[model samples]
Target: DSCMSFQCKRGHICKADQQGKPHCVCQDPVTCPPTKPLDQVCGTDNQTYASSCHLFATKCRLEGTKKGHQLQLDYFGACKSIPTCTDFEVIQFPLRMRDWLKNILMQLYEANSEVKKIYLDEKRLLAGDHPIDLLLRDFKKNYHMYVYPVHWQFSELDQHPMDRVLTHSELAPLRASLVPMEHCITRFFEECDPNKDKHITLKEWGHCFGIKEEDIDENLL
Candidate 1:
């Protein structure tokens, strides 16, 4: 009921506030429509379609069908792992990472960033040799070395603006759970951004990290 698809009187595109119910926002310049129409054609598709999803598949299975159920009944569901890549995208990844990853990726593609999609797709994430289940195989390779944080490591996930910001754990803290591939790329970027901007720079590429930068690295880190 909350889905809205209205163009501002000024032509600014806007949609439902997300929590839907009564909370959906009309984009700042947008005045509410008399009917508050949905921006997209709304209908259930029993036929499956491919979607974007999460790292650990189980996290996406539970969202209240109605954020404001009002009836005060059972709201959240159980943790069910997605059985396939397609299922994972539809059920788990898209909803849970809606704010951080899924939505952002969709937005980028919609904006006409074709080359960019290569990186955003999960297949690139677990980039294993496997034709099928690359993420699972890739995950298996890196699952072991997550014991400690390297001297300085950081990663910017969900780079697409439409994808949602990760919800449960903050990005910095989450890196602690990554493997070497996680460690390597994350560290390189932290190093790449020597001024500690959280964005990368050049000198840091060859110059940073290790004992000399240990104390300074803590700050850049």
Candidate 2:
């Protein structure tokens, strides 16, 4: 049953064993001391990673280094910043992540299978020379090209000294509560970007990386 007894540390999460353990092990949510609020330090923009039945999100973001990478990611007003080791979690997709969701959902549910889609969203961007209306208009034209990862896929994790699958079989219940969220976000852009337009002239994307040489009117003679 869902209701089971468990113990957890101050900031740790508790969950169940794969078979039948009365209680669960206490797994802490990895984080840094923090130079800022923990949420902002771990978020890509207040926007955290979504979860599904097969996945859990105790924490989606992690830190890389204090001075350079900051261990985790921080979504600043208009930029992406790294945070100290304030948060971290392994994004363990058993199979290729792109195809994992659809497969897992089909195995567990019914017609609800249609629910499985993409997992990113797009934010319209602005340029100084362009009219706001014109910018907005252009964005609408190519909304799909701007889709981005709602959940930051983490790797190069060096927080813990030793190594293991990070997630344990005992954390099942805790995982149950935490996983499965925000179906609309991750799917928003991948579904919209039907033509793979290379993020062309549109306010929806606006060269999130900055105006690239390839992203300009090269053929406009």
Q: What are the runs in model 1 whose C-alpha is more than 4 Å off?
A: 1-186, 189-192, 208-221
Kindly list the per-residue Cα lDDT of model 1 for residues 1-221, writing each as its tens digit.
44455334222333545465334222332232332122211112211111111110111122233422221111011112222122122112223433645555466567664445554565355344432223323322221221012222222432333132222123333322232112211233333344655543212421332212322232332
lDDT by residue (143-194, candidate 2, tens digit) is: 2332111011111111132221112222222222222221111221332233
Candidates' C-alpha lDDT:
0.28, 0.27
- What shift in Å separates residue 14 of candidate 2 from its native position after superposition? 23
What's the distance in Å from true for residue 149, model 2?
25
Total residue pair clashes for candidate 2: 22
Find the candidate with the highest TM-score and give its number: 2
